[PDB]
Design an enzyme around this catalytic site. Structure first.
Site, PDB file in Angstrom:
ATOM      1  CG  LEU A  46      -1.943  -1.157   1.291  1.00  0.00           C
ATOM      2  CD1 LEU A  46      -2.681  -1.117   2.602  1.00  0.00           C
ATOM      3  CD2 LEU A  46      -2.909  -1.082   0.124  1.00  0.00           C
ATOM      4  CB  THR A  47       0.071   4.716  -1.047  1.00  0.00           C
ATOM      5  OG1 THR A  47      -0.485   4.271  -2.270  1.00  0.00           O
ATOM      6  CG2 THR A  47       0.768   6.053  -1.299  1.00  0.00           C
ATOM      7  CG  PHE A  48       0.512   7.141   3.685  1.00  0.00           C
ATOM      8  CD1 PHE A  48       0.228   7.663   2.427  1.00  0.00           C
ATOM      9  CD2 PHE A  48       0.529   8.004   4.772  1.00  0.00           C
ATOM     10  CE1 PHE A  48      -0.036   9.015   2.254  1.00  0.00           C
ATOM     11  CE2 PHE A  48       0.269   9.373   4.605  1.00  0.00           C
ATOM     12  CZ  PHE A  48      -0.004   9.871   3.342  1.00  0.00           C
ATOM     13  CG  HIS A  51       5.299   6.736  -1.089  1.00  0.00           C
ATOM     14  ND1 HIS A  51       4.182   6.135  -1.609  1.00  0.00           N
ATOM     15  CD2 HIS A  51       5.849   7.452  -2.103  1.00  0.00           C
ATOM     16  CE1 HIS A  51       4.050   6.468  -2.884  1.00  0.00           C
ATOM     17  NE2 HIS A  51       5.050   7.266  -3.213  1.00  0.00           N
TER      18      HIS A  51
END
Ligand code: VO4
Ligand SMILES: [Zn+2]
Ligand SMILES: [Zn+2]
Length: 382
Positions: A46-48, A51
């Site tokens: 997933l993104t958070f 990153h």
């Protein structure tokens, strides 16, 4: 003056998308520099979480951004549009590279990297902003170009750039859609405009560049959505998250009933007690992870019931958040610049390893991390 690093994230760009004739600028950059076959995200994909893994070298189980949506006994709720949670340093573990940079007396400038809206370990980047939707490609590119050209006391050793467009198109239409390809082309072209501008500014030759994504994208065909309440009914457990990584917290006294409903193998998902999650995912020790965690199979979504209803049931969509080892979840890694190798290809590797390379390129001492410094040493020019 030491060489700057430009770190670019293209959200949701799958590893194979560099080989389709739709990324002329990135393909040229990769040929000039270094390209990995692919880069695996960490769990969850997933993104958070990813990153933040990229800039800390820590798995989500360690850095504490264990999902895009979370609950904490002290801090309360966290999700991407709760600005005072996203901006609260207490959520964010470890030391992201911009903190390392500022602590050496150098400066970092970020265009909307997850975590950059907080004062992590007390230290904000010199430049940063609250991420808002629908900013123009030129607006962000021209800002980044500016930040690389600044001299004197506002000189930036680190500049970061983020694009959402490929991910958004992937969710709406799927990774094989013309819309996803159009987004890839557009972001590639914007990056071409940045590179040409850096060359006219004379910053290109003294700037190392790393381009990554956080994860890939898989097709979600019509009819591939269930309700989270099909997994456990609401009277026995609360779904803390929906999508693909589905966390459940049993209601008081309902642990046994929840486990009876949830644990094990099902049609299009599997669930585990968090301590029993597959070891290969290196996830489940962190207190913020719900008691029970279900992983949807590739190409399936489990949604909150009100979303499932408003899900306009017509066309093909996309999702990620699946097992990070899946080819569809593979991300991009390429790098080019004065301190990086030229015309090199690297084996596929784990995204925790990027941090060690960046800390070297930024002249900061590497914080303790989960990566292997050996992996990306061959990316260096010597
Ligand atoms: O914010 V993300 O997990 O959908 O690409
Ligand atoms: Zn993403
Ligand atoms: Zn996404």
């Amino acid at each position: 003056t030491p060489h700057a690093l430009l770190l670019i994230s293209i959200d949701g760009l799958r590893a194979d998308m560099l080989d389709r004739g739709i990324t002329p600028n990135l393909s040229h950059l990769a040929r000039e520099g270094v390209r990995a076959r692919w880069m695996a995200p960490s769990y969850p994909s997933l993104t958070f979480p990813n990153h933040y893994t990229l800039v800390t070298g820590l798995r989500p189980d360690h850095h504490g951004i264990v999902h895009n949506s979370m609950r904490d006994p002290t801090l309360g709720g966290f999700w991407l549009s709760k600005s005072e949670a996203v901006g609260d340093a207490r959520w964010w573990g470890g030391e992201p590279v911009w903190v390392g940079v500022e602590n050496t007396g150098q400066h970092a400038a970020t265009w909307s990297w997850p975590g950059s809206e907080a004062a992590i370990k007390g230290v904000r980047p010199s430049q940063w902003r609250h991420y808002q939707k629908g900013v123009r490609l030129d607006t962000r590119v021209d800002a980044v170009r500016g930040w690389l050209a600044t001299d004197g006391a506002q000189r930036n050793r680190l500049v970061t750039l983020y694009f959402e467009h490929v991910d958004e198109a992937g969710h709406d239409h799927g990774p094989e859609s013309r819309q996803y390809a159009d987004a890839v082309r557009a972001v590639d072209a914007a990056i071409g405009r940045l590179l040409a501008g850096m060359q006219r500014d004379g910053t290109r030759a003294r700037t190392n560049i790393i381009v990554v994504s956080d994860h890939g994208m898989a097709e979600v065909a019509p009819g591939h959505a269930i309700s989270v309440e099909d997994i456990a009914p609401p009277q026995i457990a609360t779904a803390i998250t929906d999508g693909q990584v589905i966390g459940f917290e049993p209601l008081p006294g309902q642990q046994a009933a929840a486990e009876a409903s949830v644990l094990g193998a099902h049609d299009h998902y599997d669930c585990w007690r968090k301590a029993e999650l597959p070891a290969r995912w290196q996830y489940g020790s962190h207190p913020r992870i719900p008691s029970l965690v279900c992983q949807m199979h590739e190409g399936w979504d489990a949604l909150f019931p009100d979303k499932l209803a408003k899900r306009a049931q017509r066309g093909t969509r996309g999702s990620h958040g699946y097992d990070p080892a899946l080819p569809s979840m593979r991300a991009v890694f390429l790098a080019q610049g004065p301190d990086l190798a030229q015309g090199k290809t690297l084996p596929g590797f784990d995204n925790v390893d990027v941090y060690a390379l960046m800390s070297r390129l930024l002249g900061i001492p590497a914080a303790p991390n989960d990566g292997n410094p050996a992996t990306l040493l061959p990316a260096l020019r010597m």
